[PDB]
Design a protein around this ligand. Structure first.
Ligand SMILES: *[C@@H]1O[C@H](CO)[C@@H](O[C@@H]2O[C@H](CO)[C@@H](O[C@@H]3O[C@H](CO)[C@@H](O)[C@H](O)[C@@H]3O)[C@H](O)[C@H]2NC(C)=O)[C@H](O)[C@H]1NC(C)=O
Ligand SMILES: OC[C@H]1O[C@@H](O)[C@H](O)[C@@H](O)[C@@H]1O
Ligand SMILES: OC[C@H]1O[C@H](O)[C@H](O)[C@@H](O)[C@@H]1O
Ligand SMILES: [Zn+2]
Ligand SMILES: [Zn+2]
Ligand SMILES: [Zn+2]
Lengths: 234, 7
């Protein structure tokens, strides 16, 4: 996240960090949505993925910090692109659930749709400048803006895309490399999943793309329920 | 999808 500051150590209990057994590099984030499920982006998947919950600093462990591996991964059945990245979302079932604690708590899915003008918060362990990756997650506020700002920048993201276009039109604040999968929080709810954006991050008139969670609410709840034939919104 | 897009 560029243009922001260190997040408050207690404001992101639902935030999880994704890495692998092969490296300590955090390549994405995700959000805990209940004791045994994590919501993130499909492109964050790795064959040997590891998930850190209850973490702030990558090096200084919180007393209740936990490590988990998946017992299952779920993607949209029906997608336009062969790689499914037109519906960049995935659910990870934790091998063992976590116990809610001071630094570990679920975030709510959207209770209603939020659009243009809504102020939201982004957060992650992604790049904070063209040269630096942080050790603690950084946060900042952005706005959902008209989808038109994104359409010309990302040809692969149509006006009919189940995505939210968001950022600061002035430039300066934006998610960045390594922030994918993390939550776009609006009014205490997870309205988006960081997908992608422009290069470099934070440019004037170049908001980024976040998977619009509200649309997948039924799919998400059905997978959690145990359904395995349900499909994502068309 | 452009190579610089996914974060
Ligand atoms: C997993 O979720 C899917 C999707 O919600 C479930 O399948 C859906 O089940 C409903 C109700 O059984 C189907 O609607 C029904 O259609 C018949 C006519 O075919 C109508 O007479 C009923 O009143 C009702 O409207 C729906 O078509 C079906 N969707 C598809 C395409 O399969 C599925 O049952 C769930 N799996 C579980 C938990 O068993
Ligand atoms: O960066 C996420 C995690 O990566 C692991 O490889 C390190 O051993 C942990 O200390 C760190 O919290
Ligand atoms: O801390 C989370 C909150 O951050 C900012 O206040 C956002 O404007 C608000 O929508 C969000 O719920
Ligand atoms: Zn900093
Ligand atoms: Zn604390
Ligand atoms: Zn860059």
């Amino acid at each position: 996240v560029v243009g922001g500051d260190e997040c408050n150590i207690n404001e992101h209990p639902f935030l999880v960090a994704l890495y692998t057994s092969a490296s300590s590099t955090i390549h994405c984030a995700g959000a805990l949505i209940n004791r045994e499920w994590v919501l993130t982006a499909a492109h964050c998947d790795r064959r040997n993925i590891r998930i850190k919950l209850g973490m702030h600093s990558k090096n200084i462990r919180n007393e209740d910090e936990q490590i988990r591996v998946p017992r299952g991964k779920y993607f949209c059945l029906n997608t336009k692109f062969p790689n499914g990245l037109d519906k960049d979302i995935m659910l990870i079932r934790l091998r063992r659930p976590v116990t809610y604690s001071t630094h570990i708590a679920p975030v709510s899915l959207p209770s209603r749709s939020r659009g243009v003008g809504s102020r939201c918060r982004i957060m992650g362990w992604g790049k904070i400048s063209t040269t630096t990756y942080p050790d603690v997650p950084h946060c900042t506020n952005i706005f959902i803006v008209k989808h038109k700002w994104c359409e010309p920048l990302y040809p692969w993201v149509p006006a009919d895309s189940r995505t939210l276009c968001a950022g600061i039109l002035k430039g300066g604040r934006d998610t960045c490399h390594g922030d994918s999968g993390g939550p776009l929080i609006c009014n205490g709810e997870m309205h988006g999943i960081v997908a992608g954006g422009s290069e470099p991050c934070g440019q004037h008139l170049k908001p980024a793309v976040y998977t619009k969670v509200f649309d997948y609410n039924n799919w998400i709840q059905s997978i959690i329920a145990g359904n395995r034939t349900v499909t994502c919104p068309p | 999808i452009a190579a610089w897009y996914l974060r």
